[PDB]
Amino acid sequence: MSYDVVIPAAGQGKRMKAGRNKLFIELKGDPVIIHTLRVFDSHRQCDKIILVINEQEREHFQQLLSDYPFQTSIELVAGGDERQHSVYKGLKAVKQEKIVLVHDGARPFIKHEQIDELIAEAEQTGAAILAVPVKDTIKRVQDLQVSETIERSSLWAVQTPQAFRLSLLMKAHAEAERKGFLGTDDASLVEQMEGGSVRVVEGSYTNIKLTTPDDLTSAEAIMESE
Amino acid sequence: MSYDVVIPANKLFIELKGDPVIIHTLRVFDSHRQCDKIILVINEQEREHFQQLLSDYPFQTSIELVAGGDERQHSVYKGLKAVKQEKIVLVHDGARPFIKHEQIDELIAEAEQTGAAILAVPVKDTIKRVQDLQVSETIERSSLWAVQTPQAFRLSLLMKAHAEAERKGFLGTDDASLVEQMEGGSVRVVEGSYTNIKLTTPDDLTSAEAIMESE
Ligand SMILES: Nc1ccn([C@@H]2O[C@H](COP(=O)(O)OP(=O)(O)OP(=O)(O)O)[C@@H](O)[C@H]2O)c(=O)n1
Ligand SMILES: [Mg+2]
């Protein structure tokens, strides 16, 4: 029942345009990454947190973490140039075979309820993601000019966490690294493997990712609402 | 220079800070000098409910209620028959109240220059096709855009588009699809704003309230 969580936090936050890691931005007085860490530190089934960071920020994370009452162990692991590389470095720090969750540092509003439903699906079938139905029309665009329209009734917008049996995720990462496949999520690595299957748990539209400046306004309102 | 806007219709009476979302949306087109007419397409049996709304919220810009078919595509078509001469027509979701005139002008500017346009933003999330709560494929993310409204077209061009799409069986999801599908159909894309959100659910209202107070 017990899991480890790998939290990629090693990005620069270029689209957020804060002039520093977006994850140090304060929401209601506490950095984004502190909100995210708190969800896992307060969740009884989380044994360990592996937080993947840019090595230049390590002393800053050391300080930052010492100011807060985290009781669960938090290991700082250096990341890489892309999220996938960062995730793989974090996963190599997990010590025993078990269920592992990978969760973006930039999603601070994940709830214990959804974490619970994912771990259950991963335990049964191996690989589970949070997701929500797409509501907008999606099209592909070449040089600000439409090339085609994707059918939407079956389309879903994927969230984190994504939950996996460690062995299965490590195998997906190792194959992807050897072949040069760079996926945008951990699920797509598993999908690329022969016989790879991923299941969907419906998530909350409040589990937003903080990516652009307008996402900070949505974030403040979600906080105030709860 | 000047456009009509067709708005196809109830969820639109959901409120945002005291007023139905449709009234916030109407205000934007009413405050825009290049908007000559607003055509609001409705179910014929709700004509009184709408008359009442428009009585309570007087607008200076001309607003015409028109009877609407059983689907958005048919409603938009019915709406377009109420446009009286050749010009740019917008088609806009009533539940998108935060459209800015700046974006509206770019949409027109492009659809006069080249015939058809849409507002859109880059997709931020990974998108998967899912069948029975099991992933079937991941859609390649890189050149993906989330489409908003309004969508702006030369009337002849779009009514032409509705004409041929009527002639085949083709039911569309939005209207830009009708342009892209027949002929050598070209739709340019104007990068919109992530604030141009659609309001249906109560989580949506939570965001909308925040956007309003922010600006
Ligand atoms: N090389 C990277 C890039 C991203 N991430 C992390 O992966 C999560 C999702 O990535 P994204 O939202 O793109 O964050 P950034 O890459 O930092 O932002 P941008 O793409 O706008 O630079 C973030 O918590 C980010 O810190 C990471 O650990 N290593
Ligand atoms: Mg990134």
Side-chain angles (χ1 to χ4, degrees), chain A residues 137 140 149 154 191 200 215, chain B residues 124 129 133 138 143 147 180:
Chain A
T137 296
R140 196 176 296 287
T149 294
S154 62
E191 293 157 35
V200 173
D215 294 328
Chain B
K124 293 193 273 191
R129 190 165 324 270
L133 292 185
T138 293
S143 42
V147 177
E180 71 211 4

Side-chain angles (χ1 to χ4, degrees), chain B residues 160-181:
Chain B
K160 183 161 193 292
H162 257 93
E164 273 135 44
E166 202 196 344
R167 200 162 329 292
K168 311 160 299 204
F170 198 96
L171 290 209
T173 87
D174 64 351
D175 299 283
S177 50
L178 306 195
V179 168
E180 71 211 4
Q181 186 190 321

Side-chain angles (χ1 to χ4, degrees), chain A residues 8-16 21-23 52 80-83 86 104-106 209-211:
Chain A
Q12 298 182 290
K14 298 186 185 196
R15 289 169 292 171
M16 181 61 81
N21 197 341
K22 62 176 167 179
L23 296 180
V52 190
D81 293 355
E82 301 283 9
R83 190 188 99 102
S86 294
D104 284 345
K209 188 157 70 70
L210 304 201
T211 306

Side-chain angles (χ1 to χ4, degrees), chain A residues 102-116:
Chain A
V102 182
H103 183 66
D104 284 345
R107 292 189 187 266
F109 309 126
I110 180 64
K111 302 292 182 262
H112 291 169
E113 174 182 78
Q114 274 66 55
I115 290 169
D116 290 348

Side-chain angles (χ1 to χ4, degrees), chain A residues 39-163:
Chain A
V39 180
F40 297 94
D41 184 77
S42 74
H43 193 212
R44 300 178 94 197
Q45 286 75 62
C46 183
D47 183 49
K48 178 155 192 216
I49 301 170
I50 295 148
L51 180 64
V52 190
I53 62 155
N54 170 341
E55 185 62 52
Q56 292 129 257
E57 295 181 354
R58 176 185 299 270
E59 205 196 282
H60 186 183
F61 278 91
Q62 284 166 339
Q63 258 80 305
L64 184 61
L65 293 181
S66 67
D67 291 348
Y68 289 93
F70 291 116
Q71 296 167 290
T72 296
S73 173
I74 306 181
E75 188 183 348
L76 301 177
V77 166
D81 293 355
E82 301 283 9
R83 190 188 99 102
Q84 180 173 316
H85 308 335
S86 294
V87 171
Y88 198 19
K89 283 172 173 169
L91 296 172
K92 291 169 177 184
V94 173
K95 304 274 247 161
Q96 294 300 333
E97 285 206 45
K98 59 195 315 195
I99 296 295
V100 67
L101 266 62
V102 182
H103 183 66
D104 284 345
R107 292 189 187 266
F109 309 126
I110 180 64
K111 302 292 182 262
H112 291 169
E113 174 182 78
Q114 274 66 55
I115 290 169
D116 290 348
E117 296 172 48
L118 284 169
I119 291 164
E121 188 56 54
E123 272 173 345
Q124 300 269 38
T125 54
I129 66 182
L130 283 171
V132 295
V134 167
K135 282 161 160 164
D136 278 322
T137 296
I138 307 302
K139 301 180 191 306
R140 196 176 296 287
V141 176
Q142 298 294 333
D143 296 286
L144 304 183
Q145 175 104 4
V146 170
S147 36
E148 70 273 24
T149 294
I150 321 301
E151 204 296 317
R152 65 160 130 163
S153 61
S154 62
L155 290 182
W156 289 64
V158 174
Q159 304 181 347
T160 72
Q162 303 191 351

